[PDB]
């Protein structure tokens, strides 16, 4: 069953990534940003900045070396300012990408090579494992996780007073369907007969609120009585 | 850029023209602001609406009621960095 | 801190306020104003992204039952009050009261996308889910559970047998109630604790104002007022003056946008920390030490604040 659900999950991953073209947007725009920034840099070439013309040669081919240096000064001032703005922009986004890379490496060390108890650090649900995949300038994780479904209603109590003694579950919870009492683990319905072996005794039953009367099963008693 | 005297809508963001206010509450499609989002739907025109934040639900609390699942599902999701 | 105020600056009418020739002369400088508008628009959408990613993690909207039978525990200081139309907790009302200009040259503010009432609606829904489901509802469908049962589960998480809880129930509840009241008094008394929010507000309320004062810098020009040159000069020297004016003001604007970008990056880092804290100290129980307060972690509850989030760690 787990195998078939896993296969179905992988197939829907393939189909969902093949169908929706809008999933990879985080990988797209950054690339676009670079080109856009680069583009406007070359678009700053033909700005006159209040000087006579945007060609260096035409200023040189028409004006005098006692005169033209004012125009050249204007040109280099404007272009230099644009270039310094560019390096500021790129270096800030570089810091941003460094932040993302550190986050990705931490997810590499915790989701893949181990099994993290931190909720939603390895995707939604109870984490089981993950696999990495390479991507253009980036990484794509697949988190394989566990979720519950088909819950029901059950009636509970904190502890059970059998013989003047309080009984607490070793691991799990006491439940009742209305007629009998069972003990089960906290994430999957699996009732068991309430024994000594899955419980423990601590104190009497005159302090705990909400404690009910029931029997506990002695494993030793049918062995001792039949002998 | 040119006016219409038909159907204005004065929200906290400002004055909206070209849309119909809707009494219902839907999910946010594109953000205008102050809780107000817009979409093209039905005849069909562009509408602006108060967001519906989620499906309302109230779990039945008690002091003697426990909910325990019986079945499970393996599910795989993707995440891109 | 969660987010900062979405400011927006018009380029041209900040620089060349109602002048055709000045706008024409700035058009010779290329495409700087487009870059500034794109930068501030990126910041403004980033703030809404941060706020939405911090608070919207819950698929539903939960609410409390009317019957407040929590074994003797009390939550009245943090549960929402239907008595005020300002439908919040008392503690959030102290948070609103503790935390506390002119629009003339394109220096506009935009309203945030998420209004404060529905911020309180997520806060109420998160509190209801925590107190009615344990940690299960962050992992699937919400499952009901008695409260002291799940408190016993969290003691079983930290290394104490659940035996300890049941035989010592009521005193714990008493201590818990007393503890909550102290926090309200601790917010009713100390004014200097919330500066971590307010400085952020001050760090927008300070720099912006200085920008306006750079409108009164000559930069070598005959005057700081545009219309006086235009009322006095013939354009082939007026351009020589206006060139100085726009160069100085454009440099100041570039300084402002650079500082805003750096601050916005720091706020985004803070928001990522807050989101991880929301996912870990609220939706579950962390084994990590001092990630959710001093001591072995039991619980935490969130409360809203103007551009901020406030956690109470129960340890
Ligand atoms: C998981 C489940 O169905 N629990 C049910 C709940 O839906 C119902 O409201 C209540 C009273 O009828 O009994 C219990
Ligand atoms: C022999 C014995 O323990 N009998 C108990 C009784 O003492 C108790 O009062 C009652 C619950 O009220 O359950 C039964
Ligand atoms: C056929 C059969 O054994 N049905 C049992 C019923 O007798 C029992 O009372 C209940 C709880 O113990 O579980 C079921
Ligand atoms: C809502 C509800 O059922 N509250 C119960 C009450 O009826 C009962 O009398 C008491 C002790 O049994 O525990 C609590
Ligand atoms: C306990 C339970 O519900 N198990 C179900 C099974 O009945 C169903 O045939 C299968 C197919 O999805 O999924 C699982």
Swiss-Prot record, chain A:
Variant or mutagenesis effect after changing residue 33 to H: In strain: Omicron/BA.1, Omicron/BA.2, Omicron/BA.2.12.1, Omicron/BA.2.75, Omicron/BA.4, Omicron/BA.5, Omicron/BQ.1.1, Omicron/XBB.1.5, Omicron/EG.5.1
Effect of residue 150 to H: In strain: Kappa/B.1.617.1
Listed result of changing residue 180 to Y: In strain: Theta/P.3
Coiled coil: 28-72
Effect after changing residue 29 to N: In strain: Delta/B.1.617.2, Mu/B.1.621
Record-annotated disulphide pairs: 111-122, 161-205
Region (Heptad repeat 1): 1-49
Effect of substituting residue 197 to H: In strain: Alpha/B.1.1.7
Sugar-bearing residue positions: 153, 177, 213
Role: Subunit of the fusion protein that is processed upon entry into the host cell. Mediates fusion of the virion and cellular membranes by functioning as a class I viral fusion protein. Contains a viral fusion peptide that is unmasked after S2 cleavage. This cleavage can occur at the cell membrane by host TMPRSS2 or during endocytosis by host CSTL. In either case, this triggers an extensive and irreversible conformational change that leads to fusion of the viral envelope with the cellular cytoplasmic membrane, releasing viral genomic RNA into the host cell cytoplasm.
Protein name: Spike protein S2'
Organism, scientific name: Severe acute respiratory syndrome coronavirus 2 (2019-nCoV)
The encoding gene: S
From Swiss-Prot, chain C:
UniProt-reported outcome of changing residue 203 to H: In strain: Omicron/BA.1, Omicron/BA.2, Omicron/BA.2.12.1, Omicron/BA.2.75, Omicron/BA.4, Omicron/BA.5, Omicron/BQ.1.1, Omicron/XBB.1.5, Omicron/EG.5.1
Cysteines joined through disulfide linkages: 11-33, 16-22, 281-292
Ranges in a coiled coil: 198-242
Domain of life: Viruses
Effect of residue 37 to K: In strain: Omicron/BA.1, Omicron/BA.2, Omicron/BA.2.12.1, Omicron/BA.2.75, Omicron/BA.4, Omicron/BA.5, Omicron/BQ.1.1, Omicron/XBB.1.5, Omicron/EG.5.1
Effect of residue 276 to I: In strain: Gamma/P.1
Site, Cleavage: residue positions: 88-89
Glycosylated residue positions: 74
Positions of the UniProt region annotated as Heptad repeat 1: 169-219
Outcome following mutation: residue 199 to N: In strain: Delta/B.1.617.2, Mu/B.1.621
Function field: Precursor of the fusion protein processed in the biosynthesis of the S protein and the formation of virus particle. Mediates fusion of the virion and cellular membranes by functioning as a class I viral fusion protein. Contains two viral fusion peptides that are unmasked after cleavage. The S2/S2' cleavage occurs during virus entry at the cell membrane by host TMPRSS2 or during endocytosis by host CSTL.
Name of protein: Spike protein S2
Interval of the full protein contained in this chain: 728 to 1066 of 1273
């Amino acid at each position: 069953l787990i195998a078939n659900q896993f296969n179905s999950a992988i197939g829907k991953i393939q189909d969902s990534l093949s169908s929706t073209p809008s999933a990879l947007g985080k990988l797209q725009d950054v690339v676009n940003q670079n080109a856009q920034a680069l583009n406007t840099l070359v678009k700053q070439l033909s700005s006159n900045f209040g000087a006579i013309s945007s060609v260096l040669n035409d200023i040189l081919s028409r004006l005098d070396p006692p005169e033209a240096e004012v125009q050249i000064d204007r040109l280099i001032t404007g272009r230099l300012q644009s270039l310094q703005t560019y390096v500021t922009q790129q270096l800030i986004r570089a810091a941003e990408i460094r932040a993302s890379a550190n986050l990705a490496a931490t997810k590499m060390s915790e989701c893949v090579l181990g099994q993290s108890k931190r909720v939603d650090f390895c995707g939604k649900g109870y984490h089981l494992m993950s696999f990495p995949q390479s991507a253009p300038h980036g990484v794509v994780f697949l988190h394989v996780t566990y979720v519950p479904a088909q819950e029901k209603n059950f009636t509970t109590a904190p502890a059970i007073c059998h013989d003047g003694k309080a009984h607490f579950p070793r691991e799990g919870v006491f439940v009742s369907n209305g007629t009998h009492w069972f003990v089960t683990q906290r994430n999957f319905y699996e009732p068991q007969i309430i024994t000594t072996d899955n419980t423990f005794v601590s104190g009497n039953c005159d302090v705990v609120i909400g404690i009910v009367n029931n029997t506990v099963y002695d494993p030793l008693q049918p062995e001792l009585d039949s002998f | 850029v040119y006016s219409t005297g038909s159907n204005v809508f004065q929200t906290r963001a400002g004055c909206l023209i070209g849309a119909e206010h809707v009494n219902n509450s839907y999910e946010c499609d594109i953000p205008i602001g102050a809780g107000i989002c817009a979409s093209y739907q039905t005849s069909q025109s562009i509408i602006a609406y108060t967001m519906s934040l989620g499906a309302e639900n109230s779990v039945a609390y008690s002091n003697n009621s426990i909910a325990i699942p019986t079945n499970f599902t393996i599910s795989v999701t993707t995440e891109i960095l | 801190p969660v987010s900062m105020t979405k400011t927006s600056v018009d380029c041209t009418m900040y620089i060349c306020g109602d002048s055709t020739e000045c706008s024409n002369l700035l058009l010779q400088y290329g495409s700087f104003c487009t870059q500034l508008n794109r930068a501030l628009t990126g910041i403004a959408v980033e703030q809404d992204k941060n706020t939405q990613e911090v608070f919207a993690q819950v698929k539903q909207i939960y609410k409390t039952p009317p019957i407040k039978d929590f074994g003797g525990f009390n939550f009245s200081q943090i549960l929402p009050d239907p008595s005020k139309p300002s439908k919040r907790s008392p503690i959030e009302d102290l948070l609103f009261n503790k935390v506390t200009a002119q629009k003339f040259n394109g220096l506009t503010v935009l309203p945030p996308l998420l209004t404060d009432e529905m911020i309180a609606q997520y806060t109420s829904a998160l509190l209801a889910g925590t107190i009615t489901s344990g940690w299960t509802f962050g992992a699937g469908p919400a499952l009901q559970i008695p409260f002291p049962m799940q408190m016993a589960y969290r003691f079983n998480g930290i290394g104490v047998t659940q035996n300890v809880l049941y035989e010592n129930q009521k005193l714990i509840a008493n201590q818990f109630n007393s503890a909550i009241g102290k926090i309200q008094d601790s917010l009713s008394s100390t004014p200097s604790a919330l500066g971590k929010l307010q400085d952020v507000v001050n760090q927008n309320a300070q720099a912006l104002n200085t920008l306006v004062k750079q409108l009164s810098s000559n930069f070598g020009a005959i005057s700081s007022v545009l219309n006086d040159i235009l009322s006095r000069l013939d354009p082939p020297e007026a351009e020589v003056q206006i060139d100085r004016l726009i160069t100085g003001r454009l440099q100041s604007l570039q300084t402002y946008v650079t500082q805003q970008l750096i601050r916005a990056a720091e706020i985004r880092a803070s928001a990522n920390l807050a989101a991880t804290k929301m996912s870990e100290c609220v939706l579950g129980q962390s084994k990590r030490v001092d990630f959710c307060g001093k001591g072995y972690h039991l619980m935490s509850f969130p409360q809203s604040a103007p551009h901020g989030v406030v956690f109470l760690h129960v340890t």
